[PDB]
Each structure stands twice: as C-alpha cells, then as structure tokens.
Coordinates of N, CA and C and ligand atoms in Angstrom, one line a residue:
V17 N 156.9 151.9 -51.8 CA 155.4 151.4 -51.1 C 155.7 151.4 -49.8
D18 N 156.7 150.2 -49.1 CA 157.1 149.8 -47.8 C 156.8 150.6 -47.1
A19 N 157.1 152.0 -46.9 CA 156.7 153.0 -45.5 C 155.4 152.9 -45.4
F20 N 154.4 153.1 -46.0 CA 153.0 153.0 -46.0 C 152.2 151.8 -45.4
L21 N 153.0 151.0 -45.6 CA 152.6 149.8 -45.4 C 152.0 149.5 -43.5
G22 N 151.4 149.1 -43.0 CA 150.5 148.7 -41.6 C 148.8 148.9 -41.7
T23 N 148.9 149.4 -40.1 CA 147.9 149.6 -39.6 C 147.7 151.6 -39.0
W24 N 147.1 152.0 -39.4 CA 146.8 153.6 -39.0 C 145.5 154.2 -38.3
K25 N 145.3 154.9 -37.5 CA 144.3 155.7 -36.7 C 144.3 157.0 -37.0
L26 N 143.1 157.8 -37.0 CA 142.7 158.9 -37.5 C 142.8 159.4 -36.1
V27 N 143.7 160.5 -36.2 CA 144.1 161.8 -34.9 C 143.8 163.0 -35.4
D28 N 143.7 163.4 -36.9 CA 143.2 165.0 -36.9 C 142.2 165.1 -38.2
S29 N 141.5 165.8 -38.3 CA 140.5 166.1 -39.4 C 140.4 167.7 -39.7
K30 N 140.6 168.3 -41.0 CA 140.3 169.5 -40.9 C 139.1 169.5 -42.4
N31 N 138.7 170.3 -42.3 CA 137.3 170.2 -43.5 C 137.0 169.5 -44.3
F32 N 136.7 168.2 -43.5 CA 135.9 166.9 -44.3 C 134.6 167.3 -44.2
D33 N 134.2 168.5 -43.8 CA 132.6 168.6 -44.0 C 132.6 169.1 -45.5
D34 N 133.0 170.2 -45.6 CA 133.6 170.7 -47.0 C 133.7 170.0 -48.0
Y35 N 134.4 168.8 -48.0 CA 134.7 168.3 -49.1 C 133.6 167.1 -49.4
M36 N 133.0 166.7 -48.3 CA 131.5 165.6 -48.4 C 130.7 166.4 -49.4
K37 N 130.2 167.8 -48.4 CA 129.3 168.3 -49.2 C 129.7 168.6 -50.7
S38 N 130.9 168.8 -51.2 CA 131.2 169.3 -52.8 C 130.9 167.8 -53.4
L39 N 130.7 166.7 -52.3 CA 130.4 165.4 -53.8 C 129.1 165.4 -53.3
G40 N 128.3 166.0 -52.6 CA 126.7 165.6 -52.7 C 126.5 164.9 -51.6
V41 N 127.5 164.4 -50.5 CA 126.8 163.6 -49.4 C 125.8 164.5 -48.6
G42 N 124.8 163.9 -48.0 CA 123.7 164.5 -47.4 C 123.6 164.5 -45.7
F43 N 123.1 165.5 -45.7 CA 123.7 166.0 -43.9 C 123.6 164.8 -43.0
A44 N 122.3 163.9 -43.2 CA 122.4 162.8 -41.9 C 123.8 162.1 -42.0
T45 N 124.4 162.1 -43.3 CA 125.6 160.9 -43.5 C 126.9 161.7 -42.7
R46 N 126.5 163.2 -43.2 CA 127.8 164.3 -42.8 C 128.3 164.2 -41.1
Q47 N 126.8 164.2 -41.0 CA 126.8 164.2 -39.0 C 127.6 163.2 -38.7
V48 N 127.1 161.9 -39.0 CA 127.4 161.0 -38.6 C 129.5 160.4 -38.9
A49 N 129.7 160.7 -40.3 CA 131.1 160.9 -40.3 C 131.9 161.7 -39.7
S50 N 131.5 163.5 -39.0 CA 132.5 164.1 -38.7 C 133.0 163.7 -37.8
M51 N 132.0 162.4 -36.6 CA 132.5 161.7 -35.3 C 133.3 160.2 -35.7
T52 N 133.3 160.2 -36.9 CA 134.0 158.7 -37.0 C 135.7 158.7 -36.6
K53 N 136.3 158.0 -36.7 CA 137.9 157.5 -36.0 C 138.0 156.4 -36.9
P54 N 138.2 156.8 -38.3 CA 138.6 155.5 -39.2 C 140.0 154.8 -38.8
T55 N 140.0 153.5 -39.1 CA 141.0 152.4 -39.3 C 141.3 152.4 -40.4
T56 N 142.9 152.7 -40.9 CA 143.2 152.4 -42.3 C 144.4 150.9 -42.4
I57 N 144.2 150.0 -43.2 CA 145.3 149.4 -43.3 C 145.6 148.8 -44.4
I58 N 147.0 148.8 -44.8 CA 147.5 148.8 -45.7 C 148.3 147.8 -45.9
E59 N 148.0 146.8 -47.1 CA 149.0 145.4 -47.1 C 149.1 145.2 -48.6
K60 N 150.3 144.4 -48.6 CA 150.8 144.2 -49.9 C 151.4 142.6 -50.1
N61 N 150.9 142.0 -51.3 CA 151.3 140.3 -51.6 C 151.8 140.6 -53.1
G62 N 153.5 140.7 -53.4 CA 153.1 140.8 -54.5 C 153.5 142.3 -55.2
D63 N 152.8 142.6 -56.2 CA 152.9 143.8 -56.9 C 150.9 144.0 -56.5
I64 N 150.6 143.1 -55.8 CA 149.0 143.8 -55.1 C 149.1 144.9 -54.0
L65 N 148.8 145.5 -53.7 CA 148.2 146.5 -52.7 C 146.8 146.2 -52.4
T66 N 146.4 146.2 -50.6 CA 145.4 145.8 -50.5 C 145.1 147.3 -49.5
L67 N 144.1 147.9 -49.3 CA 143.6 149.1 -48.6 C 142.0 148.7 -47.9
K68 N 142.1 148.7 -46.8 CA 141.0 148.4 -46.1 C 140.5 150.1 -45.3
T69 N 139.5 150.2 -45.3 CA 139.1 151.2 -44.3 C 138.1 151.0 -43.2
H70 N 138.1 150.8 -41.8 CA 137.2 150.2 -41.1 C 136.5 151.4 -39.9
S71 N 135.5 151.1 -40.0 CA 135.0 152.2 -38.8 C 133.9 151.6 -38.1
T72 N 133.1 152.3 -37.6 CA 131.6 151.8 -36.6 C 130.6 152.0 -37.8
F73 N 130.7 153.2 -38.6 CA 129.7 153.4 -39.8 C 129.8 152.6 -40.7
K74 N 130.9 152.8 -41.6 CA 131.2 151.9 -42.9 C 132.2 151.3 -42.9
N75 N 132.4 150.2 -43.5 CA 133.9 149.8 -44.4 C 133.8 149.5 -46.2
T76 N 135.3 149.7 -45.9 CA 135.5 149.8 -47.4 C 137.0 148.7 -47.5
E77 N 136.6 148.1 -49.0 CA 138.1 147.4 -49.1 C 138.4 147.5 -50.7
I78 N 139.6 147.7 -51.3 CA 140.1 148.1 -52.6 C 141.4 147.1 -52.7
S79 N 141.9 146.2 -53.5 CA 142.4 145.5 -54.2 C 143.2 146.6 -55.7
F80 N 144.4 146.6 -55.5 CA 145.0 147.0 -56.8 C 146.5 146.6 -57.4
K81 N 146.7 147.1 -58.8 CA 147.9 147.3 -58.8 C 148.4 148.6 -59.0
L82 N 149.7 149.1 -58.9 CA 149.9 150.6 -59.3 C 149.9 150.4 -60.8
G83 N 149.5 151.3 -60.7 CA 149.1 152.2 -62.6 C 148.4 151.5 -63.2
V84 N 147.4 150.5 -62.5 CA 146.2 149.8 -63.8 C 145.3 150.2 -63.2
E85 N 144.4 150.7 -63.9 CA 143.0 151.2 -63.8 C 142.2 150.0 -63.1
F86 N 141.3 150.5 -62.3 CA 140.5 149.6 -61.6 C 138.9 150.0 -61.3
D87 N 137.7 149.1 -61.5 CA 136.5 149.8 -61.0 C 136.2 150.0 -59.7
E88 N 135.7 151.0 -58.7 CA 135.6 151.3 -57.4 C 134.4 151.7 -56.9
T89 N 133.6 151.2 -56.0 CA 132.5 151.5 -55.1 C 132.9 152.3 -54.2
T90 N 132.5 153.9 -54.4 CA 133.2 154.4 -53.3 C 132.1 154.4 -52.0
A91 N 132.4 154.9 -50.6 CA 131.7 154.8 -49.5 C 130.7 155.3 -49.4
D92 N 130.3 156.7 -50.2 CA 129.3 157.4 -50.9 C 129.0 156.8 -51.7
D93 N 129.0 155.7 -52.1 CA 128.1 154.9 -53.3 C 128.5 155.7 -54.7
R94 N 129.5 156.2 -55.1 CA 130.0 156.9 -56.4 C 130.6 155.8 -57.1
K95 N 130.2 155.3 -58.3 CA 131.1 154.4 -59.4 C 131.8 154.9 -59.8
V96 N 133.1 154.9 -59.9 CA 134.3 155.8 -60.3 C 135.3 154.4 -61.1
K97 N 136.4 155.4 -61.8 CA 137.2 154.6 -62.7 C 138.3 155.0 -61.8
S98 N 139.3 154.0 -61.1 CA 140.3 154.3 -60.4 C 141.9 154.2 -60.9
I99 N 142.8 155.1 -60.6 CA 144.1 154.6 -60.3 C 145.2 155.3 -59.4
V100 N 145.8 154.1 -58.9 CA 147.0 154.8 -58.0 C 148.6 154.5 -58.3
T101 N 149.2 155.4 -58.2 CA 150.6 155.4 -58.7 C 151.7 156.3 -57.4
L102 N 152.5 155.8 -57.7 CA 153.3 157.0 -56.8 C 154.1 157.8 -57.5
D103 N 154.3 158.9 -57.2 CA 154.8 159.9 -57.5 C 155.5 161.1 -56.0
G104 N 156.8 161.5 -56.4 CA 157.6 162.0 -55.7 C 157.3 161.4 -54.3
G105 N 157.5 160.0 -53.9 CA 156.9 159.6 -52.6 C 155.9 159.6 -52.5
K106 N 154.4 159.9 -53.1 CA 153.2 159.9 -52.7 C 152.6 159.0 -52.9
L107 N 151.7 158.5 -52.5 CA 150.8 157.4 -53.1 C 149.1 158.4 -53.7
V108 N 149.3 158.6 -54.9 CA 148.4 159.4 -55.1 C 147.5 158.7 -56.1
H109 N 146.1 158.7 -55.6 CA 144.6 157.7 -55.7 C 143.9 158.7 -56.5
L110 N 143.2 158.5 -57.7 CA 142.9 159.5 -58.7 C 141.4 158.8 -58.9
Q111 N 140.5 159.2 -59.0 CA 139.1 158.8 -59.2 C 138.3 159.7 -60.1
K112 N 137.4 159.1 -61.3 CA 137.0 160.0 -62.4 C 135.8 158.7 -62.5
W113 N 134.6 159.7 -62.5 CA 133.1 159.7 -62.9 C 132.3 161.1 -63.5
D114 N 131.6 160.5 -64.6 CA 130.7 161.7 -64.9 C 131.2 162.9 -65.5
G115 N 132.7 162.9 -65.7 CA 133.5 164.0 -65.8 C 134.1 164.6 -64.9
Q116 N 133.7 164.2 -63.8 CA 134.2 164.9 -62.7 C 135.6 164.1 -62.2
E117 N 136.4 164.5 -61.2 CA 137.5 163.8 -60.7 C 137.7 164.5 -59.6
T118 N 138.4 163.4 -58.4 CA 138.7 163.7 -57.4 C 139.9 163.1 -56.9
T119 N 140.6 163.6 -56.1 CA 142.2 163.1 -55.6 C 142.7 162.8 -54.1
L120 N 143.1 161.5 -53.7 CA 143.5 161.5 -52.8 C 144.9 160.8 -52.7
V121 N 145.2 161.5 -52.1 CA 146.9 161.7 -52.1 C 147.3 161.4 -50.3
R122 N 148.4 160.5 -50.3 CA 148.6 160.5 -49.4 C 150.5 160.6 -49.1
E123 N 151.0 160.9 -48.2 CA 152.4 161.2 -47.6 C 152.9 161.2 -46.2
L124 N 153.9 160.5 -46.2 CA 154.5 160.3 -45.2 C 155.7 161.4 -44.5
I125 N 154.8 162.7 -43.4 CA 155.8 163.1 -43.2 C 156.2 163.1 -41.2
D126 N 157.4 163.3 -41.0 CA 157.6 163.3 -39.6 C 156.7 161.9 -38.9
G127 N 156.9 160.8 -39.8 CA 156.1 159.5 -39.1 C 154.9 159.4 -39.5
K128 N 154.2 160.4 -39.5 CA 152.5 160.2 -39.7 C 152.5 160.2 -41.4
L129 N 150.8 159.7 -41.4 CA 150.5 159.5 -42.7 C 149.4 160.8 -42.9
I130 N 149.7 161.5 -44.1 CA 148.7 162.9 -44.4 C 147.9 162.3 -45.6
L131 N 146.9 162.8 -45.1 CA 145.4 162.5 -46.4 C 145.1 163.4 -46.7
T132 N 145.2 163.9 -48.0 CA 145.1 165.6 -48.4 C 143.7 165.2 -49.7
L133 N 142.5 165.4 -49.7 CA 141.5 164.9 -50.8 C 140.7 166.3 -50.9
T134 N 141.1 166.7 -52.7 CA 140.4 167.2 -53.2 C 139.5 167.3 -53.8
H135 N 138.4 168.4 -54.2 CA 137.2 167.8 -54.8 C 136.9 169.3 -55.5
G136 N 137.2 170.2 -56.6 CA 136.2 171.5 -56.8 C 137.5 172.4 -55.9
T137 N 136.7 173.0 -55.4 CA 137.8 174.0 -54.5 C 137.8 173.6 -53.1
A138 N 137.1 172.3 -52.8 CA 137.2 171.8 -51.0 C 138.6 170.8 -50.9
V139 N 139.3 171.1 -50.4 CA 140.3 170.5 -49.9 C 140.6 170.2 -47.9
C140 N 140.4 168.8 -48.0 CA 140.4 168.6 -46.6 C 141.8 167.7 -46.1
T141 N 141.9 167.8 -45.2 CA 143.3 167.0 -45.0 C 143.2 166.4 -43.6
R142 N 143.3 165.0 -43.5 CA 143.5 164.0 -42.5 C 144.7 163.2 -42.3
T143 N 144.9 163.6 -41.0 CA 146.1 162.9 -40.3 C 146.0 161.6 -39.7
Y144 N 146.8 160.6 -39.7 CA 146.6 159.2 -39.2 C 148.1 159.2 -38.6
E145 N 147.7 158.7 -37.7 CA 149.5 157.7 -36.9 C 149.2 156.5 -36.9
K146 N 150.8 155.7 -36.5 CA 150.7 154.5 -36.7 C 150.2 153.7 -35.6
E147 N 149.9 152.7 -35.9 CA 149.4 152.0 -34.5 C 150.2 150.8 -34.5
Ligands
OLA214 C1 134.7 154.3 -44.6 C2 135.2 154.9 -43.8 C3 134.3 156.4 -44.2 C4 133.7 157.2 -43.0 C5 132.4 158.1 -43.8 C6 132.5 158.5 -45.0 C7 130.9 158.4 -45.2 C8 130.8 158.8 -46.5 C9 131.2 160.5 -47.2 C10 132.1 160.6 -47.9 C11 132.9 159.7 -48.5 C12 134.5 160.4 -49.2 C13 135.6 159.4 -49.4 C14 136.2 158.6 -48.6 C15 136.6 159.6 -47.5 C16 137.7 158.5 -46.6 C17 138.4 159.1 -45.8 C18 139.5 158.6 -44.9 O1 140.1 157.4 -45.6 O2 139.9 159.1 -44.2

C-alpha cells in the first residue's frame, strides 16, 4: 500500500461522461463534473486507510480496512456495499447495490496513479500526478 499514499491531482480524463451516464447521473451534474479537477488524498493509520476526494463541487471521505466490507454513500448519492483489496499490486474497490456492480481500480505506472472505472460497457480512465 505504501506507494499509493500521498496527495494526487487530476491531469487527464477519458470517457468520464459515458461512465456517469451509465450510472444515471443527470445532465446538469455531468456538465460540472467534466470541468472539475479533483485532489485525492490517501493516508494510513495502522491498518486503517482514509481516502479523501476534494473539489470545488463535491467532497467525499471514506475510511476502511482492506478486505472488510463497509457501507458507503457515493458522490452521486448511491448507497452501496464496498470492499477494497490489493490484487497484483493494484488497489481494487468494488461497489455493489441493487444487483449491480462497479469497480474503481488504481494502479501506479511510471510514477502516475491511473484510475480505471468500469460500469456496464463504459470504461473511464483518469490520470493523477503526485503533488
Ligand atoms: C468528489 C469529486 C467528484 C466530482 C464530480 C462527481 C459528481 C458525481 C458523478 C459521478 C460520481 C462517480 C463516482 C466517483 C468518481 C470519482 C472520480 C475520481 O475520483 O476522479
């Protein structure tokens, strides 16, 4: 886990709109979201991880232990059952609600943090660089 810790800022995004539309997010929120550049902060205290996502539009914060399910309310106001684990060096966050699922996978490549989000047929890639 140690290599993911720190402060990261978004520098590229591909197909976020398709991902948001798949989840049912409405047009007006997709407009603002397409022009937002979040800051993600990942920290650890023993076996507890804290992931903060900050922006001018919305802010989220979750705390969890790897491998242990938790309740989460997402930026889009879904109430989901989540679990985060380490799989081949990637941090894999799975969300489930009403029979559906989406995955948020984080990998380090060349010192950047790549976040891939998949729901349905839509796949979005977002690139973050370390601050
Ligand atoms: C908290 C910052 C979110 C910015 C706009 C999001 C508004 C809601 C729409 C879809 C939410 C999808 C779930 C979270 C995606 C987070 C993306 C990321 O961390 O870059």
